[PDB]
Amino acid sequence: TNTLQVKLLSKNARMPERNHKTDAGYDIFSAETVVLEPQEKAVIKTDVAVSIPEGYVGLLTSRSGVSSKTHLVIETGKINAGYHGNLGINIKNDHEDDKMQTIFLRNIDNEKIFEKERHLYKLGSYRIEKGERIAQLVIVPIWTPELKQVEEFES
Amino acid sequence: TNTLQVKLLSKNARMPERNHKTDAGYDIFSAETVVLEPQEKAVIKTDVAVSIPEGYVGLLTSRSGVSSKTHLVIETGKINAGYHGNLGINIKNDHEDDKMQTIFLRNIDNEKIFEKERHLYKLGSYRIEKGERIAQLVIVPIWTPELKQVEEFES
Amino acid sequence: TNTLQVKLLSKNARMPERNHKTDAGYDIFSAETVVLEPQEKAVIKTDVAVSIPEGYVGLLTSRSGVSSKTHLVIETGKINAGYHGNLGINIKNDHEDDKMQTIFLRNIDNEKIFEKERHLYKLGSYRIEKGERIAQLVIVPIWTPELKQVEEFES
Ligand SMILES: O=c1ccn([C@H]2C[C@H](O)[C@@H](COP(=O)(O)NP(=O)(O)OP(=O)(O)O)O2)c(=O)[nH]1
Ligand SMILES: O=c1ccn([C@H]2C[C@H](O)[C@@H](COP(=O)(O)NP(=O)(O)OP(=O)(O)O)O2)c(=O)[nH]1
Ligand SMILES: O=c1ccn([C@H]2C[C@H](O)[C@@H](COP(=O)(O)NP(=O)(O)OP(=O)(O)O)O2)c(=O)[nH]1
Ligand code: NI
Ligand code: NI
């Protein structure tokens, strides 16, 4: 009743966490490791499925720490009450494509990642790693009345 | 009561649709045909008016299919309970302006549109056509208490 | 009960305003004066703190007038029920960095600001001034049930 059904779709999926009763949302973890170049768009698999009951909508939205620090822009997803598919993260690396190149990409804390092997990445490239806090899920009640075409409003 | 008032403002306006009782929102259709160049901003007319009752807010928000596939970024609009004006779609083609040009623009499914007449468009240009599913409306309850200036919080 | 606690953190902070009972949100004012260059990111201090009660989330979101007219993109912040810190505005000037320069920057109405002293700014630069309407706060009820790992959903 006052419980939400969560299903893991793979071994790479992590269970959402609401560590504090103070918090409004549930920590969503990536089930993928991907490198996003400037201007590049992607849908990140969480390998998690939720069964939101009717009368509610789920908001798969961005964290403030990742969005303020990095150019990673997450378009909030509206999780329909009944959708049992894989929760994707609609993401875009909004860093501009200035043609410049660097020897290291940066994490979701905007910090430079030092590698043992030298590699040439385009400047402004980010990497998201398996099991990282990149999004959060917030469930909000909704009002869905029947629509009535009207020629001029009540008042 | 448990009905929402909808008004069409022209012949080009289409009635919002909630085809499934599973869905949280209402399909919003464009009343315009416009071509958006890279970095170009616009407010798309739906020619639709809604009368949301007090204690609720409307969220004129993006669809997941259009936002994940195209560079079309819709800034979610907060529809105030009482606003009876034309619902606009605050949109931006976030494709970068790389000065390059192509012989065809692309639709809201990111597919290339083949034309009988050759025309030169800038690379990353999109066209939205009259009567297309580009946005959705989600109504959510709101808490609007009176504000009290406080020197230090309750607890 | 049906009141919200608001705390000012400095002399530069302004009290949020819900001028109409028609409106869904509360007008949020900047406590800073900053110039944002193209592609530049910042967190704007409001010097305001709110004590949202449990069972609710706050949405520190963009105004339609500023977002449709300017390239100022505000990533909606989810204000947790219990957070008593400074409300920041997660902002980005999404104007592209075209290397061009102009003798005047522009305001949150996208109008050119004429100065007595000539200065060279990069094209697409915006200035936000102390005490300006740049954001709004909308509080929405939330459902936070306990999570139960499930192998296959109820129905
Ligand atoms: O724009 C913002 C966003 C967040 N905040 C505050 C409110 C919130 O309680 C706190 C945490 O931000 P979020 O709830 O949006 N994300 P999260 O709880 O995951 O924190 P973080 O992103 O830092 O891990 O920061 C702002 O003041 N302005
Ligand atoms: O980022 C997202 C967005 C949506 N989804 C899922 C949840 C939702 O039930 C389903 C449909 O997405 P939206 O409700 O956000 N838009 P719409 O119902 O119109 O579908 P589409 O945009 O594909 O027409 O896709 C994700 O998993 N991640
Ligand atoms: O995309 C939008 C955004 C807003 N609107 C309408 C609905 C709303 O009642 C009205 C005001 O917009 P917002 O509530 O989103 N922001 P605000 O009340 O502060 O007005 P403004 O931003 O113009 O000061 O404009 C649209 O039609 N489409
Ligand atoms: Ni939102
Ligand atoms: Ni951009």
> What is the secondary structure of C43-66 as a DSSP string?
EEE--EEEEPPTTEEEEEEE-HHH
Q: Does A18 touch chain C (CB under 8 A)?
A: yes
- Determine which helix (DSSP H) or strand (DSSP E) holds B135, and give its type and residue range: strand B133-141
Type of residue at A10: S
Tell me which residue of C42, C44, C50, C62 sits closest to C8, measured CA to CA.
C50
Distance A19 CA to ligand 4 centre (A): 23
B42 contacts B91 by C-beta, under 8 angstroms? yes
| Distance (Å, whole) CA A18 – CA A154 | 43
User: Closest residue of C to A70, CA-based?
Assistant: C41
Query: Which residues, 6+ apart, have CB-to-CB distance to C141 below 8 Å?
Result: A140, A141, B141, B143, C55, C56, C57
Which chains share 3+ C-beta pairs under 8 angstroms with A? B, C
Joined together, the tokens standing for residue C22 give 């028609």
The per-residue b/e assignment along C60-73, b for 16 or more CB within 10 angstroms, e otherwise, is: bbbbbebbbbbbbb
Joined together, the tokens standing for residue C37 give 């260059």
Type of residue at B35: V
- Determine which helix (DSSP H) or strand (DSSP E) holds A69, and give its type and residue range: helix A64-69
C55 contacts C141 by C-beta, under 8 angstroms? yes
Distance C77 CA to ligand 1 centre (A): 6
Tell me how the structure was determined.
X-ray
Beta strand residue intervals within chain A, DSSP E? 3-8, 26-29, 34-36, 41-45, 48-51, 56-62, 72-74, 77-79, 88-93, 101-102, 121-122, 126-128, 133-141, 146-149
Tell me which residue of B1, C81, C142, B84 sits closest to A20, measured CA to CA.
C81
- A76 CB within 6 A, ligand 2: no
User: Closest residue of A to C79, CA-based?
Assistant: A24
Q: Does B117 touch chain C (CB under 8 A)?
A: no
Query: Which residues, 6+ apart, have CB-to-CB distance to A126 below 8 Å?
Result: A35, A36, A70, A71, A72, A93, A95, A105, A106, A107, A108
Resolution in A: 3.0
- C80 CB within 6 A, ligand 1: yes
Joined together, the tokens standing for residue B87 give 């619902």
| Distance (Å, whole) CA A112 – CA B32 | 45
Joined together, the tokens standing for residue B9 give 């403002």
| Distance (Å, whole) CA B96 – CA B93 | 8
Chain C residue numbers with beta carbons less than 8 Å from the beta carbon of A25 are 57, 78
* Second CATH level (architecture) for the domain C1-155: Distorted Sandwich (2.70)
Residue of B57, B87, B148 to mutate when probing chain C, most C C-beta within 10 A: B57
Distance C74 CA to ligand 3 centre (A): 14
A73 contacts A91 by C-beta, under 8 angstroms? yes
Chain-centre distance for alpha carbon C123: 23
Q: Whose CA is nearest to atom 27 of ligand 2?
A: A87
Helix-, strand-, coil-residue percentages of chain C, each rounded to 5: 5, 40, 55
Q: What are all long-range contacts of C100-107, with beta carbons under 8 Å and residues at least 24 apart?
A: C105/C35, C106/C70
Residue C101 sits at the vertex; the CA angle it makes with B75 and C68, to the nearest 5 degrees, is 15
Tell me which residue of A97, A149, A104, B147 sits closest to C4, measured CA to CA.
B147
Give the DSSP letter string of B57-104: EEEEEE-HHHHHHSSEEE--EEE-TT--S--EEEEEE-S---S-EES-
As a whole number of angstroms, the longest Cα–Cα distance in chain B is 70
Chain B residue numbers with beta carbons less than 8 Å from the beta carbon of C24 are 56-57, 78, 80-81, 142, 144
Tell me which residue of C32, C153, B25, B47 sits closest to A9, measured CA to CA.
C153
Write down how long chain B is. Answer: 155
The preferred substitution site among C78, C134, C144 for testing ligand 1, maximizing ligand atoms within 8 Å of CB, is C78
C44 contacts C34 by C-beta, under 8 angstroms? yes
Let me know how many helices (H) and strands (E) chain B has, helices first.
Answer: 1, 14
Write down how long chain C is. Answer: 155
Distance A125 CA to ligand 4 centre (A): 26
Residues after which chain A has a gap (C–N > 2.5 Å)? none
A68 contacts C142? CB cut-off 8 A: no
Type of residue at B59: L
Q: Is the dihedral of CA B100, B101, B102, B105 positive or negative?
A: positive
The distance of C23 to chain B (nearest Cα, Å) reads 5
Q: Is the dihedral of CA B72, B76, B77, B81 positive or negative?
A: positive
Tell me which residue of A52, A56, A65, A61 sits closest to A28, measured CA to CA.
A61
Specify the DSSP class assigned to residue C18: -
Chain A residue numbers with beta carbons less than 8 Å from the beta carbon of B140 are 57, 140-143
Question: φ and ψ at A57, to 5 degrees?
Answer: -125, 145
Q: Where are the domains of chain B?
A: 1-155
| Distance (Å, whole) CA B105 – CA B129 | 12
Closest atom, ligand 1, to C-alpha of A67: 22
| Distance (Å, whole) CA C76 – CA A104 | 30
Of C2, C62, C138, the CB nearest to B142: C138
A24 contacts C57? CB cut-off 8 A: yes
Tell me which residue of C15, C121, A149 sits closest to B6, measured CA to CA.
A149
- What is the β-pairing status of strands A72-74 and C133-141? unpaired
Query: Which residues, 6+ apart, have CB-to-CB distance to A139 below 8 Å?
Result: A4, A52, A56, A57, A58, A59, C142, C143, C144
